[PDB]
Design a protein around this nucleic acid. Structure first.
Ligand code: MG
Ligand code: MG
Ligand code: MG
Ligand code: MG
Ligand code: MG
Ligand code: MG
Ligand code: MG
Ligand code: MG
Ligand code: MG
Ligand code: MG
Ligand code: MG
Ligand code: MG
Lengths: 65, 188, 36, 127
RNA sequence: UGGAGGUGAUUUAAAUGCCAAA
RNA sequence: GGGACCGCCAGUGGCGAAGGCGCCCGGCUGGAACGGGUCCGACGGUGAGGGCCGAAGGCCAGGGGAGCGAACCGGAUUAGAUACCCGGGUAGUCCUGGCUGUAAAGGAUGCGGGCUAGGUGUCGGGCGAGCUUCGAGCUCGCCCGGUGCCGUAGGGAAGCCGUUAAGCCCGCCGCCUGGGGAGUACGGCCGCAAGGCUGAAACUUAAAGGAAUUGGCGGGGGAGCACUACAAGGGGUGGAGCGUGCGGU
């Protein structure tokens, strides 16, 4: 109901129709799957060390080249 | 009303056939015990006897009689896993298949499929020779042994070892297996 | 009919197959009127 | 002891069906398809719909005493496509996440040894 | 380095060329 | 219960005059290669007229009909959509006995013989040497016959071909003579029919045709770039009255 915080640890690359989306690797900080590393798609400027609030932690973005 | 109907079901225990040890293999639900007849359950040979090598051999047991809360089964057929045999067939090798209809000593009708993999591409006459050797060995074994002994030897790999030893004289072999068994009829 | 592989080239003409079909249609009509 | 069942997964390019039965396969425990969890026909084969259907089926199976399942996944096969759709893997992962144990996994797509003739004519779909 | 084959696929719709150059 | 079809192994691999031929066991049968101090003794090449074989489709009688699917019936797309896409569906596709004799039936290359550098794969037979789990096994070299690639002299407009010639030479048959009219008209033969083989003239026209070069273009591929491009944003114009320029009247 409040989401789970995750920390960005690596930047993969830009994607999307107009280069508006970045793909990152994050580590869950809290919850059932705390500690796991998964990849996600982010909209907006982002750098290593930022914290995202994921509403659920079972969807993983498809890998890009 | 749906959950009402589910409460009318009872659980029955399934046992392996007698000559495989007769151990428990699973549980199945049903409300009327007559509905459990002729159900088929598949188990791997690793579950019967513990060994991680024979994890790709699958056996089918069919229920024939129910007494109390127990179900007893018969042997029906045996197969190798698809992913296993799909990894044996390679380019620059030869695959020899042979399918035979046999009758055991005590009047059981069986159909048996055996497979052999050669180290390289070989000529067709050598394939015919190997297939003939397979046929001779299988016919002799069927004439000699009984149903249960034949099945046990087929699944343990004795027949395949004998076939490989006899067929080395035509061409060196990479593998030799009894690929599949299906029962067709039983004595009256 | 006789073969003219030059006719099959598509530059500046329609497809030979359908010209052949049209000619064969035309020859049926002449033959029917001849028998009367 | 241990009540184990079987999860039959049918995956195509248009839908996904998840069907949990008992060990012998003659009794149905639960059954859910992609069209029962989403509203848009375009979303039926999506991985997300597969996750939702798998979770519903797993809950229904768990409340009835099933502990683990062996998995059989198939594409349409036959004279149709031989490749499973995008919803198979998501469905497999979702069953484990819901609390079931996982046994052995295999695919049972029917394969012809030169069977019948497919649709489309000798030129196929021309789009 | 350079070539020859085979199996798969290949996300809506989108026709035309006037005045002129004379 | 039923009808059609034989996956992977499978290989510029094999066999056949060509069309064509792929599950396993048994019977009958055609051709070729290799080995040969065997037999006959020029018995050979090509071949006008003539004969036989010949994918798919079609037709005439009798069966069968799973899947697919001309015609046709519906749903969509569209300006229209007699189509492409979707749901159905008759003939046909399959078996037995005949007829038809057509394909980009293409190696777009008629067949027999002698000769003219090499290099390197692979299939069948034979010979020699070395290994060996003694296997109808493995590796290397040479000879003959098939089947691919690179290439010398030579050839060619070039693309390219090059002992599997499109090279130099000895034979025989078939065919062609600028583009259209036209594979049409008339006549004849064959066929149940659909159709097959043979085949002009009047007139019209300055090119039609081939191989390669430089550009431009593609609802072809790859790399790069731009606030007179987009994405994320800030402010507007298009509605009213007026200032000024333009078309028209
Ligand atoms: Mg010509
Ligand atoms: Mg639906
Ligand atoms: Mg249709
Ligand atoms: Mg279109
Ligand atoms: Mg002759
Ligand atoms: Mg052909
Ligand atoms: Mg050669
Ligand atoms: Mg050359
Ligand atoms: Mg005439
Ligand atoms: Mg602009
Ligand atoms: Mg913008
Ligand atoms: Mg304004």
């Amino acid at each position: 109901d409040e989401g789970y915080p995750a920390e960005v640890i690596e930047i993969i690359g830009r994607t999307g129709t107009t280069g508006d989306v970045t793909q990152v690797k994050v580590r869950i900080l809290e919850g059932r799957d705390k500690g796991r590393v998964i990849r996600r798609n982010v909209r907006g400027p982002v750098r290593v060390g930022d914290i995202l609030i994921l509403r659920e932690t079972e969807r993983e973005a498809r890998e890009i080249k | 009303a749906a959950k009402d109907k589910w409460k009318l079901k009872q659980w029955y225990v399934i046992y392996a056939p007698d000559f495989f040890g007769g151990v428990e293999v699973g549980l199945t639900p049903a409300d009327d015990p007559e509905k459990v007849l002729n159900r088929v359950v598949e188990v791997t040979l690793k579950d019967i006897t513990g060994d991680f090598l024979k994890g790709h051999v699958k056996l089918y047991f069919q229920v024939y009689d129910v007494k109390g809360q127990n179900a007893y089964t018969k042997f029906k057929g045996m197969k190798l896993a698809r992913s296993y045999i799909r990894s044996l067939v390679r380019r620059r090798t030869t695959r020899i298949d042979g399918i035979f209809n046999i009758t055991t000593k005590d009047g059981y009708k069986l159909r048996v499929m055996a497979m052999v993999i050669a180290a390289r591409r070989i000529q067709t006459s050598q394939e015919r020779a190997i297939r003939k050797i397979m046929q001779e060995i299988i016919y002799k074994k069927a004439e000699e042994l009984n149903f249960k002994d034949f099945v046990l030897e087929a699944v343990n790999g004795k027949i395949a070892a004998e076939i490989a030893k006899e067929a080395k004289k035509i061409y060196p072999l990479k593998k030799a297996e009894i690929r599949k068994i299906k029962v067709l009829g039983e004595p009256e | 009919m006789k073969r003219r592989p030059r006719k099959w080239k598509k530059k500046g003409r329609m497809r030979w197959k359908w010209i052949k079909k049209r000619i064969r249609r035309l020859k049926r009509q002449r033959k029917k009127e001849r028998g009367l | 002891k241990e009540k184990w069942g079987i999860a039959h997964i049918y995956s195509s390019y248009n839908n996904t069906i998840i069907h949990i039965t008992d060990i012998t396969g003659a009794e149905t425990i639960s059954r859910w398809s992609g069209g029962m969890v989403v509203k848009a026909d375009r979303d039926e084969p999506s991985p997300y719909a597969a996750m939702l259907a798998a979770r519903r089926a797993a809950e229904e199976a768990l409340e009835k005493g099933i502990v683990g399942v062996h998995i059989r996944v198939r594409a349409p096969g036959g004279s149709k496509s031989k490749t499973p759709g995008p919803g198979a893997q998501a469905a497999i992962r979702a069953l484990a996440r819901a609390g079931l144990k996982i046994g052995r996994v295999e695919d049972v797509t029917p394969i012809p040894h030169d069977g019948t003739r497919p649709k489309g004519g000798r030129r196929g779909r021309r789009v």
